[PDB]
Short mmCIF file of C-alpha atoms in Angstrom, two decimals:
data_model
loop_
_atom_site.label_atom_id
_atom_site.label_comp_id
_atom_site.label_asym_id
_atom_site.label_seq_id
_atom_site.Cartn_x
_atom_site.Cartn_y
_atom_site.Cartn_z
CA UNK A 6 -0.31 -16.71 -59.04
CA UNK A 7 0.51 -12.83 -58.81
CA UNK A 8 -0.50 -13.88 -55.02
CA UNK A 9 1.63 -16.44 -54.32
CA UNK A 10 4.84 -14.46 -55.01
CA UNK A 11 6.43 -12.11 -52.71
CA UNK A 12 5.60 -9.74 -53.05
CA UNK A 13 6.48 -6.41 -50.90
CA UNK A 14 6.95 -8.73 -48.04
CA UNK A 15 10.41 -9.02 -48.15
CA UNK A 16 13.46 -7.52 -49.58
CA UNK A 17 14.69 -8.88 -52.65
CA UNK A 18 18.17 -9.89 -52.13
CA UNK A 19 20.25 -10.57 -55.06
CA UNK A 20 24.10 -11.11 -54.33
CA UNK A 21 26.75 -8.72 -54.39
CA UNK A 22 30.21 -8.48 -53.46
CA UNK A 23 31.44 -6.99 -50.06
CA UNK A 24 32.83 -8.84 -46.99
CA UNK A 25 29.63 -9.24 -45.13
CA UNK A 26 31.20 -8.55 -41.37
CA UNK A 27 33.20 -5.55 -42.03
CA UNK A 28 29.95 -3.56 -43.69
CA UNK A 29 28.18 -5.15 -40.61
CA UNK A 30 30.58 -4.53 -37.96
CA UNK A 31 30.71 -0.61 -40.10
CA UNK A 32 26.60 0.07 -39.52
CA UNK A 33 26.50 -1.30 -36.31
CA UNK A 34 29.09 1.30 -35.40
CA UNK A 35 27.72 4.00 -37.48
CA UNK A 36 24.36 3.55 -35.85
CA UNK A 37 26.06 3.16 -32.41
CA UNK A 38 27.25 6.68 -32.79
CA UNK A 39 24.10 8.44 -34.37
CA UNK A 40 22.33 10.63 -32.01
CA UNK A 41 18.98 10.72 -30.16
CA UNK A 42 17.15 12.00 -32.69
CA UNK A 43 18.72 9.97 -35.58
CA UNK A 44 18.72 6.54 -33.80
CA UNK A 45 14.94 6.88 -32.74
CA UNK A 46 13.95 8.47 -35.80
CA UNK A 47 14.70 5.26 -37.84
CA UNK A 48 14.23 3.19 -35.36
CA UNK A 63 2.59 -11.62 -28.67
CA UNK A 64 3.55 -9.11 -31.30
CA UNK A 65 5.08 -12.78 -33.30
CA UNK A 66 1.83 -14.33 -33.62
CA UNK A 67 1.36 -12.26 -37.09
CA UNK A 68 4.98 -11.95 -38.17
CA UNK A 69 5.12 -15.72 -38.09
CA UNK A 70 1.99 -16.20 -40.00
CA UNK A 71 3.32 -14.09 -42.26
CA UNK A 72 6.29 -16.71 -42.71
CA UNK A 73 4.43 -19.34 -42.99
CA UNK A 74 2.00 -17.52 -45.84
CA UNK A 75 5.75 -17.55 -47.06
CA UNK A 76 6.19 -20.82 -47.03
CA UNK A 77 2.78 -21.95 -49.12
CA UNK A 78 1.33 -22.60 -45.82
CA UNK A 79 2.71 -26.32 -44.88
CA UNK A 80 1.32 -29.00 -42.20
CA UNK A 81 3.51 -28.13 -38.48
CA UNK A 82 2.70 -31.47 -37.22
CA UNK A 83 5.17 -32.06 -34.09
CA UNK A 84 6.69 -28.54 -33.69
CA UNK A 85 9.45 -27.33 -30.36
CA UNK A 86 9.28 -23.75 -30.73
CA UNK A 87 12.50 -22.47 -28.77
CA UNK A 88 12.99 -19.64 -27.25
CA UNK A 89 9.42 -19.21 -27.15
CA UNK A 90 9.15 -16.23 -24.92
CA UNK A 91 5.83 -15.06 -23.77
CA UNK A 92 3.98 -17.69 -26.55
CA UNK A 93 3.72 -15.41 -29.46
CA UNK A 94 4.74 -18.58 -32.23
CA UNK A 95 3.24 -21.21 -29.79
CA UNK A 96 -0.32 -19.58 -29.63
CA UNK A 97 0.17 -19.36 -33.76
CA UNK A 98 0.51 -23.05 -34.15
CA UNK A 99 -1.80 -24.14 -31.27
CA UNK A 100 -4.41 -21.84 -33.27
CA UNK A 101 -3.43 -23.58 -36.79
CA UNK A 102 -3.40 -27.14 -35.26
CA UNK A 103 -4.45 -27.61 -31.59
CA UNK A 104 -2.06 -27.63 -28.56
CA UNK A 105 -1.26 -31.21 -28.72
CA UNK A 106 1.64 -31.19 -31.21
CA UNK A 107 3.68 -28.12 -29.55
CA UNK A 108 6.27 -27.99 -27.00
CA UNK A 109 7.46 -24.92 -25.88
CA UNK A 110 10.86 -24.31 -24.41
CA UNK A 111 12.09 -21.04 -22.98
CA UNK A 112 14.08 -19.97 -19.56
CA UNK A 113 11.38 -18.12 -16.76
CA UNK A 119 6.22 -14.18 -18.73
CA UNK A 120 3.70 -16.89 -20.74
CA UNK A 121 1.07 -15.19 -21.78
CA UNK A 122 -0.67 -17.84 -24.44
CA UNK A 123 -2.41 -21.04 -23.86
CA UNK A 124 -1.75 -23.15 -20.86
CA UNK A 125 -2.35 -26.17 -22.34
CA UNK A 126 0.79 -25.91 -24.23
CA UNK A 127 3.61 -28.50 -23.41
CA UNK A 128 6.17 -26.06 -22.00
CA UNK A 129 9.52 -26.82 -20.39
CA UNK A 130 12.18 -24.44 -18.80
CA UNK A 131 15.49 -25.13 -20.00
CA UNK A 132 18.31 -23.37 -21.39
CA UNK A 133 18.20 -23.84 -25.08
CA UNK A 134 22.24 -24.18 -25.73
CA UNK A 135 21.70 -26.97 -22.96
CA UNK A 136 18.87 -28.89 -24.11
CA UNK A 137 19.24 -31.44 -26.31
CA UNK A 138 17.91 -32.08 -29.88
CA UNK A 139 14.82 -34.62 -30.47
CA UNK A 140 13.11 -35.26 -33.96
CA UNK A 141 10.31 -32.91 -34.91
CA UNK A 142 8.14 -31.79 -38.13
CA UNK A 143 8.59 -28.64 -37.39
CA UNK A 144 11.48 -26.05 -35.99
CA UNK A 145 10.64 -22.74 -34.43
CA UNK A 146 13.67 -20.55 -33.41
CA UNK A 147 12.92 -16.89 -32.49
CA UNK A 148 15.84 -16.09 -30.06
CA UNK A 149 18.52 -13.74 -30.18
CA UNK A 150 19.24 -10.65 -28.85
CA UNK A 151 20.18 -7.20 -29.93
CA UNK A 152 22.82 -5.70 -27.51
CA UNK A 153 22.70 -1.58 -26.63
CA UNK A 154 25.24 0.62 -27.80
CA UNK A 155 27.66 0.30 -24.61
CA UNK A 156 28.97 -2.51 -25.53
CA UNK A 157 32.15 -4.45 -27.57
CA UNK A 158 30.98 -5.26 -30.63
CA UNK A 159 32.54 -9.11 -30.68
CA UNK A 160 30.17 -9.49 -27.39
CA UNK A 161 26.73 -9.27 -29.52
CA UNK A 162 28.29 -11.59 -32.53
CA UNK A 163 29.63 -14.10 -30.32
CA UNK A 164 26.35 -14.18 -27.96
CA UNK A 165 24.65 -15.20 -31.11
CA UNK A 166 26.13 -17.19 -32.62
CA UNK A 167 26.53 -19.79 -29.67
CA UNK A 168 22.46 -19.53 -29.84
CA UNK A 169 22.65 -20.38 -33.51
CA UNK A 170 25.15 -23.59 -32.52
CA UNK A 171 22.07 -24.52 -29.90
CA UNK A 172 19.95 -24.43 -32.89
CA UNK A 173 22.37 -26.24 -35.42
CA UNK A 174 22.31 -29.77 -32.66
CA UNK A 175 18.51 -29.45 -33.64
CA UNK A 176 18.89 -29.10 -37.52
CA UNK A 177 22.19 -31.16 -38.40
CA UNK A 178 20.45 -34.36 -36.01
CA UNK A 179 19.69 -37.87 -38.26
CA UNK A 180 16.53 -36.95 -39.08
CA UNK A 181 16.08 -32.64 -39.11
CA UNK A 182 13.02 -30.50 -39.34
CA UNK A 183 11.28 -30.99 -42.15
CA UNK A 184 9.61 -27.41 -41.71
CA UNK A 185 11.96 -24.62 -39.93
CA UNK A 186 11.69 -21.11 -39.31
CA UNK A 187 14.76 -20.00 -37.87
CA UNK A 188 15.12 -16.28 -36.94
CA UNK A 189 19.14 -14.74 -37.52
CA UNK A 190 20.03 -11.75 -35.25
CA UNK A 191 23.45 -11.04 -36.56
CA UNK A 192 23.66 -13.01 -39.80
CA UNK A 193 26.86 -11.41 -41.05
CA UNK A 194 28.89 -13.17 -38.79
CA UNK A 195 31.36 -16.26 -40.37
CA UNK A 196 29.61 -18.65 -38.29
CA UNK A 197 25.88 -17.68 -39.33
CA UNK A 198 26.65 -17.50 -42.67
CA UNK A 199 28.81 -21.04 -42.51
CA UNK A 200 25.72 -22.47 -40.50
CA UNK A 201 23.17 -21.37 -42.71
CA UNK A 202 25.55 -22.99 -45.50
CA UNK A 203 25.79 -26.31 -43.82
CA UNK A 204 21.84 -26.54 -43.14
CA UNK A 205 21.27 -25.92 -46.52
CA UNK A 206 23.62 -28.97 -47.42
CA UNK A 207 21.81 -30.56 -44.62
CA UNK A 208 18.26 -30.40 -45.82
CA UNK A 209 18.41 -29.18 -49.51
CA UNK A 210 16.47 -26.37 -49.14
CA UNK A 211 16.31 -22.63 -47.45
CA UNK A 212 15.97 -18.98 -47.84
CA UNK A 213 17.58 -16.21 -45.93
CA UNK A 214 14.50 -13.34 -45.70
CA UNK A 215 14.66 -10.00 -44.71
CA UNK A 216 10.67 -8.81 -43.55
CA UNK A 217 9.69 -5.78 -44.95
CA UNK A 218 8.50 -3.48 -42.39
CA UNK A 219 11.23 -4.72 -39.77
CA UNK A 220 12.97 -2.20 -37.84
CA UNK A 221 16.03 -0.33 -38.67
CA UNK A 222 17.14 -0.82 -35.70
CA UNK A 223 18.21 -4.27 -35.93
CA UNK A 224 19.57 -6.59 -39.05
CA UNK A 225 17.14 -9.48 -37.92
CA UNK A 226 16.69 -11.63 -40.78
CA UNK A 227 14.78 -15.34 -41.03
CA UNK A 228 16.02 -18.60 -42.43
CA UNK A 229 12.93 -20.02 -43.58
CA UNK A 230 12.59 -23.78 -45.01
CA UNK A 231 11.28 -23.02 -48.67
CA UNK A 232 12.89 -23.99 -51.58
CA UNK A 233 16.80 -23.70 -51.90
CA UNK A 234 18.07 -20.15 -52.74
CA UNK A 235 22.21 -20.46 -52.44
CA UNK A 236 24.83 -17.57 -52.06
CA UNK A 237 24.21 -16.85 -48.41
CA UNK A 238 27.20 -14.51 -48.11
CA UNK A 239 26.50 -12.40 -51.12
CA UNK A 240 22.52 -11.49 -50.02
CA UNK A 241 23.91 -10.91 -46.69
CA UNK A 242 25.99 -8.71 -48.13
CA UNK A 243 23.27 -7.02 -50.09
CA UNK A 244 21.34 -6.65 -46.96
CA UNK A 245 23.78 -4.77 -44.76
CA UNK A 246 25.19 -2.95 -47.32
CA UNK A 247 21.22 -1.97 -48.43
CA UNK A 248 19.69 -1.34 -44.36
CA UNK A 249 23.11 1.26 -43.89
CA UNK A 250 21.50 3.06 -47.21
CA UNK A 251 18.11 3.06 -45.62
CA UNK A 252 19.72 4.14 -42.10
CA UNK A 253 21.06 7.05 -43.74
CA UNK A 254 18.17 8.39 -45.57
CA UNK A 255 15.89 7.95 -42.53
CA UNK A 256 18.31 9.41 -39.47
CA UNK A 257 19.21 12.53 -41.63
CA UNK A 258 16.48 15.33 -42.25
CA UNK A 259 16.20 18.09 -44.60
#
């Protein structure tokens, strides 16, 4: 009851206004600039933050589950734990530190193509250092999130997803989170409590529908520059 609702483990998000990628594309600079001491002062490790997710998510049956981008096995080893290693396939570019008997295949996830699954694990994405053009970060994820919207927009999509968002201020996160709500008729943008500063990670997770995408990213980025602020400065 009081249990099943979240809950301090994730923000709450209401909408607001604000252009989402200009207050995005503003912190990211901000923090770009912040010194030594600010940046660090506010700024296999998966297996619990997805099982926190999927606490999230009442728990649900994986059944046939590709986790992509599945890295050293963090999400894999969850699942294989929750269900046995028979339903998983793990797909990544090589290092694998879970299970061997998980199904795994090396291939480049914007090359691969879709097939029908239960469940969809996405926990790719990078965050790019400070030397860099900002565009080069937005547009490097985003063509991971097209990768991911072959799986999702297919005949028959996930029935279960958890779907991590790097950058999910850009036009074409927030338009493809849009669509695979349309899509499926369901999904929730989190944001963990707990995460890092550092990064505006957030998760797209397959519980029931919660719409105006754009205005809790807004929230969001417009709510972590608050929190950057009051941790980076001292005194």
């Amino acid at each position: 009851e009081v249990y099943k609702g979240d809950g301090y483990k994730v923000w709450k998000l209401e909408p607001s206004l604000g252009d989402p990628l200009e207050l995005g594309r503003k912190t990211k600079t901000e923090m770009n600039a912040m010194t030594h001491d600010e940046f660090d002062r506010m700024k296999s490790k998966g297996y619990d933050k997805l099982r926190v997710l999927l606490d999230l998510m009442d728990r649900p049956r994986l059944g046939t589950t590709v986790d992509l981008c599945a890295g050293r096995g963090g999400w894999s080893e969850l699942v294989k734990d929750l269900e046995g290693p028979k339903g998983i396939t793990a797909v990544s570019l090589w290092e694998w530190m879970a299970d061997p008997a998980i199904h795994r295949i090396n291939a480049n996830v914007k090359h691969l193509r879709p097939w029908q699954v239960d469940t969809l694990l996405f926990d790719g994405g990078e965050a790019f250092k400070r030397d860099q053009n900002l565009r080069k970060e937005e547009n490097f994820n985003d063509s991971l999130l097209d990768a991911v919207d072959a799986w999702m927009m297919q005949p028959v999509p996930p029935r279960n997803f958890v779907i991590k968002i790097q950058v999910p201020y850009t036009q074409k996160a927030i338009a493809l989170l849009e669509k695979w709500q349309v899509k499926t008729g369901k999904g929730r943008l989190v944001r963990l409590a707990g995460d890092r500063l550092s990064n505006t990670v957030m998760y797209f997770l397959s519980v029931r529908l919660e719409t105006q995408i754009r205005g809790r990213v807004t929230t969001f980025v417009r709510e972590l520059a608050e929190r950057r602020k009051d941790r980076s400065l001292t005194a």
